Design a binder for these strands. Structure first.
Ligand code: ZN
Lengths: 334, 74, 53
RNA sequence: GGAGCGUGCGGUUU
RNA sequence: GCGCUUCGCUCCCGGAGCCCACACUA
RNA sequence: GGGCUCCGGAAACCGCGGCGC
């Protein structure tokens, strides 16, 4: 069924804090149901970067052509590398953060500097599956710890003589020329990187959603000139996508405005949350309409976030949602 | 000094590849089964359990070591 | 470039035929873009045609 | 006339 | 001969504007 | 006093330098 599952993948259970809590449809804007302009305002482009230009030029171009005021990308690719590169727009740019720690998946062509029997190649390839060393130690720095890097899988699809084609899943900042070169050394003959192309960046996949500069630009003009949304619409993802992999907590409509005005989020405002949350880690706070509000770091274990009733549970750090959308509802009595 | 491993081959780029059970480090003196200085290290890389030590030699003759236990001087 | 894909089927390869799949493979990396995009005009004409606009 | 991710230095038009 | 040398994000320093919110119980 | 948002921390050159076809 599968050999390709990363830490981002693992499906995390919803635990319900208040059974009854419910969202008034009138306030806010559910992602895939918000006006084209606002959809752009808070959206992310899953772009298929071409080889040639640097990761930012591409961005720069998009900004220019779409007449945006701001854009930016998370995780830069070398100009020769193509593939999945998410481009965040306008009010959404900061989301990018989320993606940096997130797992990567690639397709790579390995050229060899010498003929190794095929049978033994897919064997030395194997042993590079799991906890791998990514920098040598004993310096002046008499250390604790060490530089382990995680490689989730190595899959060899094809191998003609000196060229080797393989797919691979990797942890955050695994340098990829660096890996081939090392297996190169290890086989002896020596190797390098013919091509490379990113098939995954966290929630971002090479799928029905992945768009080239060409269709992008073009769908844009279809909207601007012919007045046709759907095509250009289906090109922009919501920002809520940039967090699909993260731990989330869902909060009563009452709580939102406080947070949008930069209040930290306290236990009585949580409707439901993800299991397995631990202390001080990035979390995304969502309205019951599954729209994002802010990012913070967990102050409590999810495992008990629900058992407690008062106190704070997320130092809110980044306000995405506008203050506008939700009324001020802390106009209480005592 | 503990043992390092059997030399599996010579890398065409200029390194002795001794396969290992424990991790050494950058600039460790590597010797021969009779304390004959062989080289210094430049890389350990691969499975944290059973790694690879790559050696950049500094005597003119490299390939003599294939299939030998190159001990790792402290 | 060398890396290839079943269009219909999505698998990757170096071969020009899909191993156990239908059609002929295409170069994986997407075609190059220039910011001038001197010819988009034409392209869009084409595209309109292909998808009733 | 601020630092880093990241390569910068010399002169002129606020 | 052509292109690139940074779109952005984090940190510091400096404004300006919102706010001080344990979450209104149907 | 505590947070959150937004605007700063320059732009247009010409000379060298660096990077890639
Ligand atoms: Zn196929």
């Amino acid at each position: 069924e599968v050999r390709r599952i990363l830490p981002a993948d693992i499906k995390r259970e919803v635990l319900i804090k208040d059974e009854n809590a419910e969202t008034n449809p009138d306030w806010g804007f559910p992602p895939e149901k918000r006006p084209i302009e606002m959809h752009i305002q808070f959206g992310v482009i899953n772009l298929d970067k071409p080889p040639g230009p640097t990761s930012h030029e591409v961005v720069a171009w998009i900004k220019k052509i779409l007449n945006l005021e701001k854009a930016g990308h998370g995780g830069t690719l070398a100009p020769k590398v193509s593939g999945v590169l998410p481009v965040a727009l306008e009010k959404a740019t900061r989301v990018v953060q989320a993606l940096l720690p997130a797992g990567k998946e690639y397709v790579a062509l390995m050229h060899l500097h010498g003929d190794v029997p095929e049978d033994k190649i897919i064997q030395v390839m194997k042993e590079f599956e799991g906890e791998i060393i990514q920098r040598p130690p004993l310096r002046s720095a008499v250390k604790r710890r060490l530089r382990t890097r995680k490689v989730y899988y190595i899959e060899v699809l094809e191998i003609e003589g000196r060229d080797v084609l393989f797919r691979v899943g990797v942890e955050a900042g695994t340098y990829i020329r660096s890996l081939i070169h090392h297996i190169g050394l290890a086989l002896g003959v020596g190797a390098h990187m013919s091509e490379l192309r990113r098939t995954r960046s966290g929630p971002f996949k090479e799928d029905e959603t992945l768009i080239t500069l060409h269709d992008l630009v073009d769908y844009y003009y279809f909207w601007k000139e012919d007045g046709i949304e759907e095509y250009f619409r289906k090109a922009i993802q919501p920002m809520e996508k940039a967090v699909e992999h993260l731990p989330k907590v869902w909060i009563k409509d009452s709580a939102v405005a406080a947070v949008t005005h930069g209040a930290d989020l306290a236990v009585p405002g949580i409707a439901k949350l993800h299991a397995g949350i631990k202390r001080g880690d990035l979390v995304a706070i969502m309205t019951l309409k599954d729209e994002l509000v802010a990012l913070g770091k967990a102050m409590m274990t999810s495992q008990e976030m629900l058992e407690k009733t008062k106190g704070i549970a997320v130092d809110v750090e980044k306000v995405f949602m506008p203050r506008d959308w939700y009324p001020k509802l802390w106009e209480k009595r005592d | 000094m503990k043992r390092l491993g059997k030399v599996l081959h010579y890398a065409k780029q200029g390194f002795l590849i001794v396969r290992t059970n424990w991790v050494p480090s950058l600039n460790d003196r590597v010797v021969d089964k009779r304390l004959q200085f062989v080289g210094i290290v430049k890389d350990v890389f691969g499975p944290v359990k059973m790694p690879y030590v790559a050696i950049k030699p500094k005597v003119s003759n490299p390939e003599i070591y294939v299939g030998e236990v190159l001990y790792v001087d402290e | 470039f060398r890396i290839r894909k079943c269009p219909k089927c999505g698998r990757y390869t170096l071969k020009e035929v899909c191993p156990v799949c239908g059609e002929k493979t295409k170069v994986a990396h997407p075609p190059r873009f220039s910011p001038e995009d001197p010819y988009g005009e034409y392209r869009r004409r084409w595209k309109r045609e292909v998808l009733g606009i």
